[PDB]
Amino acid sequence: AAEEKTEFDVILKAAGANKVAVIKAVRGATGLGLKEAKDLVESAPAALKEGVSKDDAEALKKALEEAGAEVEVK
């Protein structure tokens, strides 16, 4: 094959025992209304980002892990 993976997706599986930090990371990564964000997280799993730079992917993920949440890389 000859395909360059320069498009990664960041999905949120489990907010973990730090929904407060998650919701923050979310709004920070997106900026959706408090509600929308709430529902999103509460509607896990759910995509947070699609076709974003790897650097950004690992950045957000790292943030999730720092708080203690479960992320998914696609």
Swiss-Prot record:
Keywords: Acetylation, Methylation, Ribonucleoprotein, Ribosomal protein
Residues where N6-methyllysine is found: 35
GO molecular function: mRNA binding; protein homodimerization activity; ribosome binding; structural constituent of ribosome
GO biological process per UniProt: cytoplasmic translation; translation
Listed result of changing residue 19 to A: EF-Tu-binding and EF-Tu-promoted GTP hydrolysis reduced
Region of interest: Required for recruitment of EF-Tu and EF-G, and for EF-Tu and EF-G-promoted GTP hydrolysis: 7-74
A Gene Ontology cellular-component term: large ribosomal subunit
Coiled coil: none
Post-translational modification: Lys-35 was found to be 50% monomethylated.
Task performed by this protein: The binding site for several of the GTPase factors involved in protein synthesis (IF-2, EF-Tu, EF-G and RF3). Is thus essential for accurate translation. Deletion of 1 of the L12 dimers from the ribosome (by deleting the binding site on L10) leads to decreased IF-2 association with the 70S ribosome and decreased stimulation of the GTPase activity of EF-G.
Subunit and partners: Homodimer. Part of the 50S ribosomal subunit; present in 4 copies per ribosome. L7/L12 forms dimers with an elongated shape. Two dimers associate with a copy of L10 to form part of the ribosomal stalk (called L8). The ribosomal stalk helps the ribosome interact with GTP-bound translation factors. Forms a pentameric L10(L12)2(L12)2 complex, where L10 forms an elongated spine to which 2 L12 dimers bind in a sequential fashion.
Note: Ribosomal protein L8 appears to be an aggregate of ribosomal proteins L7/L12 and L10.
Name by which UniProt lists this protein: Large ribosomal subunit protein bL12
Source organism of this protein record: Escherichia coli (strain K12)
Gene designation: rplL
